[PDB]
Amino acid sequence: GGYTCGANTVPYQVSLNSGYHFCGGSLINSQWVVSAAHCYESGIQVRLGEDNINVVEGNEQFISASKSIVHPSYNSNTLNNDIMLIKLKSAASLNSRVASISLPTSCASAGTQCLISGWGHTKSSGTSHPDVLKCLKAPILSDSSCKSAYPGQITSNMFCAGYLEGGKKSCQGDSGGPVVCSGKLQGIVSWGSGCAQKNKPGVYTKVCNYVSWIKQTIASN
């Protein structure tokens, strides 16, 4: 059923704030964040080093976004290619509590354990959530199990993680938040019934498919 992460124990976890916390993201180098395309908005401030999003606790860095880049093939209806890059106006100061997470070299496999983290804010859902960072350890599901859970909706750019039994709900991730497996950012919180229904997995953007695009885009902007 997940747990309270602990302050600054997930040092790559970002809050995106446009007046309020509206999405999560992952710091992938000192000047770039990975989030979901469905998180796209104007006037983004990136907030690093957060634990309680409503209290200044001493390790925060607030940096305005320079621009956001939604994936060229993002479809807002199907959520295929649900990935967006956010450039920071200035480089974050990296330390133990604020640190980047590595992009994957290879995709992850079913059965691999991942860490999903966030404040539980899903964009435009209206759902209640806590103010401190929450965590869930969950396994990647097989392609076949994922497709069986969501018939007609899982593309090659998506994967499922979570639990099909237990009677729990998984509401930890924010829209756009990290799914980190063996020290690599493998997923982005995208969609699913995992919070609304018990025994359903989350659906995540498959980051390994996008590494070339991410690297090329950063290198040119």
Active site residues: 38, 82, 175
Please say which residue, 119 or 210, places its beta carbon nearer to Zn ion: 119
50 binds Ca ion (CB under 5 A): yes
Residues contacting residue 11 through CB under 8 Å, at least 6 positions apart:
27, 49, 96, 97, 98, 99
What tokens does 107 get?
Answer: 């995709």
134 binds Zn ion (CB under 5 A): no
Q: Which residue is nearest to Zn ion (CB)?
A: 121
* Residue recorded with tokens 């539980």: 120
Contact stretch for Zn ion (CB under 5 A) within 69-77, 114-122, 145-153, 204-212: 114-122
Task: Tell me, residue by residue from 119 to 148, as one string, x for binding to Ca ion by CB under 5 A and - for no binding.
Answer: ------------------------------
Question: Got the DSSP string for 32-63?
Answer: EEEE-GGG--SS-EEEES-SSTTS--S--EEE
Please say which residue, 50 or 82, places its beta carbon nearer to Ca ion: 50
Please say which residue, 55 or 164, places its beta carbon nearer to Ca ion: 55
Contact 140, 202 (CB under 8 A): no
121 binds Zn ion (CB under 5 A): yes
